[PDB]
Ligand binder design. Structure first.
Ligand code: DBS
Ligand code: DBS
Ligand code: FE
Length: 287
């Protein structure tokens, strides 16, 4: 399940949860489909190694890669474009696991998935494995260290009594997420208590309504509005403007927090800088 690597010696033999690859050291033509690992290449000064990115889903904080060749979107993967580039490495996360075999035909394909049950250790493993390919472990370890310090700063101001609910909105549907989920970092790493520790659910969450939100009466509601990533004009603010949500402590104290979906939904948690931004976003909403 974690990435492991043996040096031998112009290359690494690399094993991860999807399979095995010989990856050359210092690859010079890397197609990156995980946006977080893309941010990490920037933080490690490896921008020139990147030859393909998913320009259809390129967020505001990664616009320094806007000039790179497109390999489509995180879901709409453009295989002909990837093949045309003749990359020496393709890096993917969970969203492209269904395309593994076709990708691995083109070139070695490294899986940098984030484990929702073990976010930090998978994050470190992902970043260090990538850094190892380039002999950059020292630099990566220093930046991981900074992230851990940001985590400690954020934890330090968390109000132990208060509780949060995490929701996703899509069209007019609300779904809920708790510990060990795709947004679990809020509870599992930053220490914010859940209104319901037992939601323990999947990729697009547990169906709920406003009645459920009032019943839980969260002090904080963290909202990931998926409509923004695609078709509005529906917006979480609209969905949540009703008398049930309005009675809630979160609504009353203006602690309905609209998290930037270009980080939370697109899931750039592998990024040495984007993960920091996400941590500060949570810290600043609760401090
Ligand atoms: O198309 C997507 N998901 C399908 C399942 O909800 C859908 O039909 O919208 C989709 C698009 C961009 C990003 C995603 O994570 C995603 O799941
Ligand atoms: O593969 C995913 N979802 C599929 C729904 O079955 C999809 O491709 O839409 C998927 C995986 C991680 C994160 C996602 O947002 C996501 O949509
Ligand atoms: Fe999705």
């Amino acid at each position: 399940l974690p990435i492991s690597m043996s040096d031998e010696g112009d290359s690494f033999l690399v094993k991860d949860s999807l399979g095995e690859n010989k990856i050359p050291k210092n690859p010079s033509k890397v197609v990156i489909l995980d946006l977080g690992i893309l941010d990490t290449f920037d933080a490690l000064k490896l921008n020139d190694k990147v030859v393909g990115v998913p320009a259809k889903n390129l967020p505001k904080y990664l616009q320094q890669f806007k000039n790179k060749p497109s390999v489509g979107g995180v879901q709409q993967v453009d295989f002909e474009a990837i093949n045309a580039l003749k990359p020496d490495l393709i890096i993917i996360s969970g969203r492209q696991s269904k395309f593994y075999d076709k990708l691995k035909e083109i070139a070695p394909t490294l899986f940098v998935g984030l484990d929702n049950a073990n976010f930090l250790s998978s994050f470190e493993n992902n970043v260090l494995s990538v850094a190892k390919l380039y002999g950059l472990e020292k630099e990566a370890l220093e930046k991981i260290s900074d992230i851990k310090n940001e985590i400690e700063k954020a934890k330090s101001i968390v109000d132990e009594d208060k509780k949060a609910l995490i929701i996703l909105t899509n069209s007019n549907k609300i779904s809920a997420f708790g510990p060990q989920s795709r947004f679990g970092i809020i509870h599992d790493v930053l220490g914010i208590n859940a209104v319901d520790e037992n939601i323990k659910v999947g990729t697009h969450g547990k169906s709920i309504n406003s009645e459920f939100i009032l019943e839980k009466n969260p002090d904080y509601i963290f909202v990931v509005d998926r409509n923004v990533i695609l078709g509005n004009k529906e917006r979480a603010q609209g969905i949540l403007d009703n008398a049930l949500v309005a009675k809630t402590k979160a609504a009353q104290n203006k602690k309905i927090i609209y998290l930037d979906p270009e980080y939370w939904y697109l899931a750039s948690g592998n990024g040495l800088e984007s993960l920091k931004t996400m941590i500060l976003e949570i810290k600043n909403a609760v401090k």
